[PDB]
Symmetry: D2
Subunit: 207 residues, 4 copies
């Protein structure tokens, strides 16, 4: 297109005007800011997977492959799941529409919604999407830590730390959601802790 | 870690010092330069999937979901598969090692290697990885265009163009690999054309 | 070896001595008793999918493909999920052994176990596996009924009914678990009732 | 409806009237004749996976899980892929109808058809489907044998043998397609020979 031509022009102008990976970054397909811009990391530091609503699905061959490769082959010692506010995937999950094949992918998010349905049901409707985004990140870290790949790494004494962050488009800050695991025991404790802290609602948003 | 602390410091300093998507960008997990930096695109323009060796696997629920969502729901009219030189996933595919679960993901690349085994067998060993990277991009575009999602979009007269590029880390330029499809007929012609053009070897690299 | 020679001898001897399918049968790979034997149906009546612990995982391309083909192309009007007692898959899921790749598959079952943990915990330890087998079937009918494929089949007025049964290996009697949907409303209602019924315990099953 | 009542009546009547598995059986969801009937094996001998057109897709979590569980946990020493003539899945794959989601599943079969297009093209049109059914089985044994699971089972000295058969619905006789591997070398050799043999055509099959 003229859109494709413009892109080739931008690329040429950009390029003209102008190592080991240490992190696996699992982000969302509709997040606007690259991991590299958020973290100000040196190119090559980041190994990056992006899927809709930044999920670690138990049986997703794509994401699991990336994880096994990062951990077993690349020897990466930090995996970060990063969510973000105003997440179109999360809003897509919460809407009552038949969107087609994507809805099947998003049913995992809806399972998370129902798992925390008491919490999300005590909360004013217009605030739920942000809560769900945050809880999602906690649950995906929990899923990551329960994979065979990560359990096995921990069991053979490999150094591996999982992290679960969210960034707000309003200020650019990475906010730690509380689930940080270096072992299965630290995974269970920090997960429980994080859900408990998340379940403390602001009094002005309670139904 | 001190690596995680440094990252939070970089993020804070960065953030302090500091819309509709029109493209689906399918890139590789080990590529260093973000789509946004390569294309100099406005944030929100890009919807991005990253997997190892930038594949569209026939039955990958992750990637297919992203594609169905982009096309059917977001109404994106351009899907770009971008490969890159010095691709660790491609080198991982070509190596003779048991790397574990990831090897299963990379068997699709090896199927592509064998499909073009005459071409790649006429070429000096040390040049094959770059050829395979380029051929990979052509084949993934072909795979994308053969998905039910894309066929159906074309058949109901939706505007949808597929693109297959590679960027070289040495100069930052996006190089078009020749497969550009707006229909099933343009997909077959440009695919054949592109393989034929790729199969013309430099005389100094021929065995 | 001789095992295989024997196999061919058995078959040669068996063979010497001697159509629209209407049901989709989803059953477990462990299951001893074939669907035809259970139902005394004629050859060709059954279209069969077998996986470990008879799952309809939201994002499993294999099973969803079977379901979409069955519903949209074969026009099958009845889908049956069939569990069984003494299910090795269920037993595998409840053990805390590292079994490797399959553990990731069985994590969906453990999610279900946790989901119904209060109920399952108030059962006798030697009855829990069979209770989970039954709960599993109810949950998989629920999952089947929330697929985009089934939902939109119902939405466009296609006649389609979902069933979830279990047979005891000891006696071979099919027992209906109570989740039976001809639409999304009847899925909700009968799933809610099915779980509610399973939650009324018979004293001899009580811890 | 009455269909289902009848089903339960059939079963009640059938039931009233009236263990280590050693084989993994991968077969087609269409297949009319159960594995036990084909082999006259005892209940519990067979661990069974059924999918459309009996595929071992490189990245299918469902089938790979079955295989890993069978090999690593059940310690099964024989894996059998069994195709059949008049295969609806094969026929679906060869038609150029848009069938929806399942077409993506069947694209792997079309890749195989293209791979052997010269051979298949010199056959009579009414023999091609059955020829592709046989080629499919050989290719799926090949795929099975290139899985990380099988390869590393062989690498660590585990006894494991792969088989690929086809039965004609007309007569029920299992016929070995010639790919039979007890190791990666014997996979290569017997796959090369199996295809070579299938390529020697009998004149009555010639166009
Ligand atoms: Zn998002
Ligand atoms: Zn790469
Ligand atoms: Zn079972
Ligand atoms: Zn078949």
């Amino acid at each position: 297109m003229d859109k494709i031509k413009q892109l080739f022009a931008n690329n040429y102008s950009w390029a003209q005007r102008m190592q080991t990976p240490h992190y696996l970054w699992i982000a969302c397909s509709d997040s606007r800011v690259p991991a590299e811009k958020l973290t100000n990391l040196e190119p090559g530091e980041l190994f990056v997977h992006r899927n809709v609503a930044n999920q670690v699905i138990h049986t997703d061959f794509n994401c699991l492959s990336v994880v096994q490769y990062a951990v077993d082959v690349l020897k990466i010692e930090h995996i970060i799941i990063c969510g973000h506010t105003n997440c179109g995937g999360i809003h897509a999950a919460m809407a009552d529409k038949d969107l087609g094949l994507i809805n099947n992918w998003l049913l995992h998010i809806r399972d998370i919604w129902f798992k925390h349905g008491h919490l999300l049901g005590k909360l004013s409707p217009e605030k739920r999407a942000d809560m769900l985004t945050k809880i999602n990140v906690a649950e995906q870290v929990y899923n990551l830590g329960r994979t065979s790949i990560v359990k096995s790494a921990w069991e053979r004494g490999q150094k591996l730390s999982l992290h679960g962050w969210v960034y707000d488009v309003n200020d650019g800050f990475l906010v730690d959601q509380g689930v940080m695991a270096t072992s299965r025991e630290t995974l269970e404790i920090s997960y429980r802790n994080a859900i408990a802290r998340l379940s403390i609602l602001d009094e002005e948003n309670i139904l």
